[PDB]
Structure formats: structure tokens, C-alpha cells
Design a protein around this ligand. Sequence first.
Ligand SMILES: O=C[C@H](O)[C@@H](O)[C@H](O)[C@H](O)COP(=O)(O)O
Ligand SMILES: O=C[C@H](O)[C@@H](O)[C@H](O)[C@H](O)COP(=O)(O)O
Ligand SMILES: N[C@@H](CCC(=O)O)C(=O)O
Lengths: 649, 649
Amino acid sequence: CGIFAYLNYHVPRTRREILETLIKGLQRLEYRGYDSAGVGFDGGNDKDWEANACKIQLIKKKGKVKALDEEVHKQQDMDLDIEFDVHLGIAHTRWATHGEPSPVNSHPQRSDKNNEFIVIHNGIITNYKDLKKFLESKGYDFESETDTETIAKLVKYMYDNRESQDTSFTTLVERVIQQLEGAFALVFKSVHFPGQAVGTRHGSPLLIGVRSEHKLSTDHIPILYRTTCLFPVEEKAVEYYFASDASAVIEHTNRVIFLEDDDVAAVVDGRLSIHRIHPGRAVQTLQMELQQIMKGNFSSFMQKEIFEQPESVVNTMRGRVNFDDYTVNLGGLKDHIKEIQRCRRLILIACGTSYHAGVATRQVLEELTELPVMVELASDFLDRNTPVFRDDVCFFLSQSGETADTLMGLRYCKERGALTVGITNTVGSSISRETDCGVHINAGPEIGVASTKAYTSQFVSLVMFALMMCDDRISMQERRKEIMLGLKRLPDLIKEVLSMDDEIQKLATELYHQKSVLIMGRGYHYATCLEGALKIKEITYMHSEGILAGELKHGPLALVDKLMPVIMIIMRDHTYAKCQNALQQVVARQGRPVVICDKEDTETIKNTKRTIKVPHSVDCLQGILSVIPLQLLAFHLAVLRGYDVDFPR
Amino acid sequence: CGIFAYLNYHVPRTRREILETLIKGLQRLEYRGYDSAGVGFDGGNDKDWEANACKIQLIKKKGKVKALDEEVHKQQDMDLDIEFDVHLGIAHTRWATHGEPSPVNSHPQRSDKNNEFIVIHNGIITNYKDLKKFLESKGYDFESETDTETIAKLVKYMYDNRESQDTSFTTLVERVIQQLEGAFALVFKSVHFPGQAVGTRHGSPLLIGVRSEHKLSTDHIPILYRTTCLFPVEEKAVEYYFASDASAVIEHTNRVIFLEDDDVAAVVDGRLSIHRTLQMELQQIMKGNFSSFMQKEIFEQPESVVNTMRGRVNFDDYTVNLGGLKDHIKEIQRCRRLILIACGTSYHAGVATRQVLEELTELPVMVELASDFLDRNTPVFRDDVCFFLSQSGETADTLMGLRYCKERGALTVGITNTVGSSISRETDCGVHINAGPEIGVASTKAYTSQFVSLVMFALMMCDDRISMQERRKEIMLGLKRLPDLIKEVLSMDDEIQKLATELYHQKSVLIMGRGYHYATCLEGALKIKEITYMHSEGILAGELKHGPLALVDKLMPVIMIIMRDHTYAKCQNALQQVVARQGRPVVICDKEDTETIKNTKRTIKVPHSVDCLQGILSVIPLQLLAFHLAVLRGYDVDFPRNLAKSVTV
Ligand SMILES: O=C[C@H](O)[C@@H](O)[C@H](O)[C@H](O)COP(=O)(O)O
Ligand SMILES: O=C[C@H](O)[C@@H](O)[C@H](O)[C@H](O)COP(=O)(O)O
Ligand SMILES: N[C@@H](CCC(=O)O)C(=O)O
């Protein structure tokens, strides 16, 4: 699930320091969930590091990384004070798929009892059955029920059947991946190629970080097919960081290379080259900081990411909104904003909360672009073979940028010649690369299990795009100004909503024992219902459902009685009167609902017992304020019930 | 709501023959509103019926009509033996969407403490608040909170300031409607005008039935402007039946006059004048041998399906011809998008046929909930084809969307089950699904008939594509076999009733499907909500992994739909995810799905049909399941709480 490897080339490091780096690397990957982890490093206790490069030691264990950290330092036959001028250590966290969690089934997987080759793997090898039969017929005995082991045994098969005594480590791996089917991110290590690393991916992220106090030969690595590689110029010293997630690299360096499918990256004599069976891979700078993946003073990542939303919203608008002259500029669309305006339809495709962001901005997109806006769930979009045309603009909302159904929707539309735009939050992700253009919502990494700041950052990003699509219309200047003053005031308004956290805990204690809750709303807050009810489902495990208010009299209103908890959303927009009508329909049937409304709606505050009173904003922005109380309610309910809000489940 | 009045002119009826005709008229209209009821007739106990038309009696009580039928009887003041030669009586059942359903709020309303004018109203007055303040200043005291009272206190204000001593009852009503705003259907009665009735409409149905053993003077009453009246030629014997619907009159006669907007009908001296045969058998509105309309309407779907295809599908030569579209089909193919607009179950019928509409028309298909369609002011264009699905043809939100689309030059199509309904008239063209009257509040045969209709339309849109000839043949053979396969499903009634005994106590249930059965699980979830009051929610199977799956444990009831179409494997993956969360689901599957039947305890095995027709079969069990669950919980399936049928306000 998580991969991290640390190669120090002519940068002296003691075995203690190497192990602490690997463990610290896995600590940055734990948030993805896992059941076991392991490390691989050169063994032996010969004081000269050059003689220990033929003994690979492994320490794998089922449990948390801490237990692994304890097992590392709990080795009597291991001297931690040996200094290695050159060394490659690899680490891995496992999410079991093939084989039950156990030390044997943990990574790194070895090629034999002498550990001539070891490999860490993220993904699944579909044809591991056949590959295992073939290697067993050639005389290789397996010890684990993991598909990963077939990789270790196979690379040794190529090595044992090499035509020349000096075939490259790269050539060996090329022959392995050419026999593999499915998805995989791999890092290899071998006693026969000491100090060298080989990384390759297909359908799984893999990146390489680099650091050196010396100048590097290039910032754009060219691809080599079967002056050209990356290395420090005047000296040898250099450090490489293979990782499946930037979060494990950023504290050491912000210079990274994102590998692409079928890339085979190799480090030989401290020089990094990328082979493939003038295109090149860029060495780019990440704007990510270690502080963005730490809880800080908060007790959970969920709490942090909700309460930091005044900051994340500001990070989303930075360099993109100019309140001094009411102009909007998404740099990611400069070379495509012209074509997009000559198109005839917008299609927003996403899963889960990302899809709700589409619903939350569909109206304002229709208002300002005057174009048809169709919001689709990616899985259903694929089932129906939806008609798509060359003059369609297709947005793909995805925080991770790797969600399969959304990604497959992306590739579907590209085949039909539509113009594709990625709204992502993960640099280097598949959806950010394969779209024609895109916007990075720059909300910072989302470490929590549920989407909190990503939903509101997507909300803001799509509103900003809408503002770009009508920057030439005289009749809409006023409307644009109204909206951008609302964005100017939004962060302060979000703080105001968070300052009512106390009022929300009271509501949580009132719903502590409840099993169902109906969340009602219409117009700009239809999405607020759905997203609220999804959060309370995902985090609290109670049956929260979002009900479009205009639909009550067509059936759903039958659930209302004096026992069914109800939360209604009644804001000061054009649907105010209609929402009041829905409230009367509920109360008329013995419903006693909790209402989320504007601070100054004196009428409903008096006639309704419990009301959450949020500040008034622009109609097409209220959704951001009205959803936060529901984020907090889901958070507090889970806490009251003893759940771990940072646990996937 | 419902309206019914009985005017017998020189046809001797005792006071019991009239009260049992008013109640029997409301029972025919009860399914339109059953929160309260009331009747209005002539009081007094004088043998000579003439000295009793100056005294009005109002018997109004809370509850269904059977609560009023007992309040009318066993009274100590009304002598049910007086013979009336001329008499008028008005009745009404109300849908109390607001306030309390008290006898004071029920209709008929009154204008003072002596009952000089009583009115029964179907609709809403959008300015009754201004009429209430104008009338309170002149010396009129109000009693109720309804908007109907402002119609009674105002018809008396025009009578207190007339210019001549004998102003016709029409003139008084003409002055009232000029001050009323919104929609309304009214039937007046006054002591000053004995035996005279006035019936005007504007945006709400209102017809007049007539019966007489004598010949009628004419068959085309001429509309007048401030050899003219409909009356028996030689004698005076005539019976009139004011009613907002045709079912309350078919039992007494099949000769009605469908009024129009702003037509002020008036019966004077037993002569019907307007100022400014029915094609239904009584059997169609009788439960027959079933204990409920909903059970009948479910088990009669084999016939209603056939009645939808009659004279429209030819299986010998595989031709589809919808007469209602012959003059527009050519222009519909030159359009560029399909939009389906509806509410509730009708909206589900759009979801259930969206995929096949996209396949056979190759056009974009967009399915919209009417209420949200209006809140967003959706972009619509002259080259859009907009369908409006409505069993009643009167649903307010759907109807407003129609007029919204006409204003934007779109080609509109009505898919209705009511001839003469607003939606069937105001659309450029349309199809009558011809399923028969639907009395049960929950739509059952209407859904499956709307389904078939949209499929027939799809078959027309592609009858000129060679490449789709085989696909057309496959679907039409499925239609030929569908009625019998529906019977095969209904034969599992007993098996469904059992599984209901295992769930009637639960509070929630999740229904999961994708593709062609996304609609199935939504419509099923709606039905269970509407008549069993369980918290049932439809969940798109593809979305489970994105949050809702967290709500599944060994306790949470789950129903899954897994059919043999292109999503079988994906549905199998969702089923494996559910079991991993310890779920124990009921699976609706195809009989030949042996793998599914072995590994799942509770299964409902339905016969295999064409993929785009399978939805009709997979939904019927949920219709039956909702029925049995309601019976187990002691509820009534023909009168669910908190609403009625057809949302016209
Ligand atoms: O609570 C929300 C979850 O995070 C989940 O619903 C998420 O929104 C989807 O899995 C889409 O993922 P992406 O946004 O990464 O595409
Ligand atoms: O089961 C519920 C009802 O059938 C309901 O969903 C109905 O569909 C709408 O209240 C109006 O729809 P029509 O306009 O077709 O009557
Ligand atoms: N399929 C491998 C790797 C899974 C992973 O960690 O992503 C296993 O189960 O061991």
C-alpha cells in the first residue's frame, strides 16, 4: 500500500540513521491503512561497509509500524553503529489482498533463502497463478501466499538465465514487467547490484525524490530506449527517495520525479536514469510542506481539516482572484479558456463527495456560462455508454486524482474527442496528467478519511471557473462583483460558523442515540443534504439520508412523525418561501425539526426550537457555510460514540 | 382535494338519498384527499320542501370520509325523511397540507354566522392575505386560517353592494373571481338563490355531469359574454353532478361537460348555462375481488402493460406506431437533446429508460426532477425535446416546467394517463399510456406503463437504422413475452410475504442496484417509504465504496439487485463487499443465476428478460414487498399518512 526507499550515495549514514529514516518514511504512509510492514537493508557487522553488500537482512512483522520500530532496535546480533558510505534501504506497508497478514506474507518478498533479490510491491499481479506454476516447474519453491513473491522469484529466473555475465539490473526488470499483468509499483534490490535501485510502475503511483548540496546535471531527465542521466556534477554525494506518496519525501526534499506507466528508473553509481521499451521526465518542485500532513494541536486529522477550512479556502484562491479589480485567473486554463467558451455543453463527472461538489455548483455554472451542465456519477456514466461529443467540455473532480471510475470516465471522453479538464488536489496524479488542462485546488493534502476541505475547495474552484466564463458579459458585472465580495468575506464567515461548534455538540448529544436522520433542503443546498447525509453515514454509521425538499409531497414525507429526527436547511435565497412551505408540511405531521438558517431569519428562529444560525452570504456560496455544521455534527457524533474518526473502516 | 355536489331538480329525493349520494361521491374522490371532509345541504324539518331552502346545514368532521359518514348519521336534529323535489348539496374532501385538519378548516366554508354563502374550493388563492385585510375593515369577522374563507367572505361582500335587487348569481361570482389570484375550482350555494349552483374554474379541473330520462335540448352549450341552456325539453326531471373528477360521476351517468378556464357555469331553474360521453367503465375504478386498490393495480399490471401497447405494437412485422406522435416524429429526430421532467415515481420511469433512450436515439438524455429543474432555471433551447411524465397530468411542478419550456421554444411531449389533463393539452404532442385509472396513492401500474411507453418511443426513433434492426427485434420479442413473465413474478406473492415477516420490525433497509436497476432500487425505496414508513433508501451500487458501505453490518437489512446484463460482474463485486461487512442481503436475481442462488440464503428468482426490460420485472417484488410490509405493520395501503395522490398545488 505504501512504499518508501532511501538510497544514500557517498553520504555517510550509520545503520541506526538509515533505519530511523525508513521507519519515519512509513510513519508518513500509515494514514492509508495497513496490516503489516517490513524493511530491507544490508546486514553484517564488518566495519568496512564494502564487504557487507552481499548480505541482505529483512525485518517483517504483522502489526503497526511502532511494533516494527521496536523489533528493529530489539536485535542483539545487529550493530547499529556501522557507517555506510553507500547503501539502499527499502520499506513497505501492506494492505493484504493475496495471503493473510503474517510475517511471511509481509514485504519485502525475497527470491530465495539467501535474499539475492527482494522487492516491495503496491498492487496486484493478476496472472500470479500462471507465473507461479511456471516458476515451480523450473524449480523455485515459494513460501508465501502473496502474489508479490512471484515477482522476486521471477527476477531471479531472468538473472539465472542471463546471456551475459554483465546484463544490467534494468534489463532484468524489463523482462519481469513484460511478463506481469495488472497494476504494480515496484522497488527492487539485489546483492548482485549493490547500492543500485530499480523502480517501475504500471497503474500505481511511484515517484523519486532527490537531494544534494551540489548542482545536478539536469532538471529534465530524457528517456532511454533499447549528458542523459541525473547526477551531481562536480562530486558524487547524492540522496534518492523512492516513494509511492510525496508525503514520505517532502521533509527531506521538494524535488521529485513522477514516473509514468512502463518507466523503469534505475540508480547506478549514484546516477539516476529512466529507461523505456525528445520525451523526458521533469524534476519539479512541490509546494507541499511537512506541516500540512501533521495533526498539530488538533486531536484528529478530521478536526484539523474542518477547522483549517478558512485557511484552505484562501489557499485555493491565492494568485487566482484579484479583489482589487474583480478579476479571476486560473493559470491552468490560460491556453484552453478560449476553446472551452466555443463549446456547447459542460459535463461534471466524479464519485462520492467530489460528485456532490458538482451538484453544489451546477446552478451557478448554468447561470454564468448559460450552457447545459450535466452532473454525472462516474460509475453510472460508464454503465450507460453516455453520448459524448467533440464540442463537450468534461470536468473530472477528484481529490486523489486516481479514483478508477472517474479515471475511466476521463479516458472514455478522450476517445470521443471531448475537451477534458481535471479538478484535482494531488500533483502528479493520473487525472491531472491525462486531462488536456486542469486546476490544482491547492487545498493541501487530505489525510483524513473523509473529504472535508476538498469538498469546499472544489466548490470554490468551480465557482472561480464560472467567474472566468462570464468575464466578458456586461450584464453580469454586478453578479460577478457580488460573488467575489462574497469570496472575499468567506474565510471570515467560515470562522464564524466554526465558532458555533458548541451549539453543534448540543445537537450531537440530542442525536447521540438516534438511528436515522432526514436532512432536507433544495436549490443551492440539495448538495448540502446529500453531502451532509454522506458524512454522517461514513463517519457516524447512522442512517442519514438527503431528501430534496420539493419531493416531500410525492412520497418521502410519510417518514415524518414525532420520532423521526429531521434537519432542514432554510436560507435567504429565492427558494426561501418554498422552504418555509416544506417546514409547514413537516410540522403539520408532528415533526420537530432542527433548522439551519440565516442569523437574521427572526421568524423561523422563534417558531423553531433548535436552530443553527449561520451568517448570510451570496446565494451561490451559502452551500459552503451550511455544510460545515454537518461536517462537525458527524465529527462530534462519532466522538460521542467512541469511534476513531481517523480510522478508515 | 376533491369536489362533489348533487343537484336534483324535480326528482324527489329524501334527505337520506342525498346525504348518501354526497358521501358516495366523496368516497370516489377520497383518494385525492382524506385528511378531512364535509357536506352542505338544506336544513329545516318542514314537510313542504320549499320552506327549507332558507336554512343551510354544515356537517364537517376531521378524518377520512368514513369519519364524516358517521357524523352525518346518528344525529338528533336532522330528520332524514323530508321529501325534496328541488335541492342542492355540496361536498368536499380536503388535503390539509398546512395547519391542523380541523372541522373549522375543512370545507364548505361560510361567510357569516347564518350561512348565506358556502363554497368548496380546490386550489390556492395567492392573495388571500390582502383579501382578508380588506374584508376585516368593512365589518367581516374571520374564523379559519384557510385561504378558502376569503372566497366566502367576499361573495357576500359583492351581494351587500350590488346595484339591482335581482343580480344573477353569475354576476356575484364573476365579481369574486376578478379579485382572486391563482388557481381555484369553486362550487357555490346560497340561501338567496335556492337550488341554484355556480361552477367556475381556473387552473383546476371541474366538470358537470347530467342525467335525465328525457332528451337534452343540445349537445354544445354556447359560452356567453356579459336555445342556450342545457335542459330537458318537455319535462323538468334532471340531475346534475358537479365534480372535480370523473370517477365520482361515472357511477350516476356518463354525460359530463368539461369546463375551461374562466367558464362560469350556472344552473338556474334547472337549466345549465355557461358564462364568460365518457370513455370509462365503472369496473375500472372498483377493487373487484381484491382487498385493496394497490393490490389490484399491482396484480393487474399484465393487463395494463398490454393496454399500453394495444393498437401500437405489431409483433408480426415488428412495427411500432404511437398515433400521438405521427405528425411530430420527423421533427423530433432533427433535434439535439432529450429532457425528461417529472416528480417522484414518474421521475424514476425516466431514470429507468434513460440508458435505452441514449442507446437507440444516440441523443443526449437528461432526466430532471421538476422542482429542482425550476429552482435552477435550467438552460433550454429551441432544438430541445422535453418530455413530461405525469400519471395525473396535473402535477404542479411538472406543469410549470412544461410552460417554462414552451416559453423557450422547445418541442414538448406529454406522457400522461389522464385525457384532458393540463399536460396532455398544453404539449405539442403526447402519448396516453392507457393504463386505466389509478386509485391507489402509490403508483404501480402507472410506473410500468410509463416505462413501456418510453421504450416504444425509443423503438420509433431507430426504426430506420439497419444496424439496430436486430436490437429492435430483441426488445419487441421481450415485450411480447413480458405480460406472461409478469404473471410468473406475481406467482411468488407468497414467497415475498414470508421475507416480509423477517423485516417488518426493522427500522431501515438499503436497496442496492446499478445500471438498468438504479431506478428499480430508488422506486422500491420510495414505495417502502410511502406505505410502510420504514427508512428505506436506494443506493447506487457503484457508490458503495465511496462512503455508504460503512452503514452495512450484520444488523442492517439489505436488498440487492443482480441481473444478467453487462453489469453482472460489477454487481457481484458489490455483493462480495457487502458480505465482507457481515451483511446478510436479500438478492433479486435471475432464475438461471445458479452461482448467486447457491451462495445466498434469501433470493427472489425472477425470469430473465431483455436487459432494457428487466427493470419492469425486478421492481414488481418491491411493490409486493412494500404491500406485505404495510399489512404486517397494520397500516392501510390505499391511504398512507401525511399526503394523498397527485400534487396539484
Ligand atoms: O467522504 C468522501 C470520500 O472521501 C469519498 O466519497 C470520495 O469523495 C470519493 O472516493 C471520490 O474520491 P476522489 O475525490 O479522490 O476522486
Ligand atoms: O408513489 C408515489 C406517487 O406515485 C408519486 O411519486 C407521484 O409520482 C407524484 O406525486 C406525481 O406523479 P404524477 O404526476 O405522475 O401523478
Ligand atoms: N498484493 C500484495 C500487495 C498489496 C499492497 O500492499 O498494495 C499483497 O497482498 O501482499
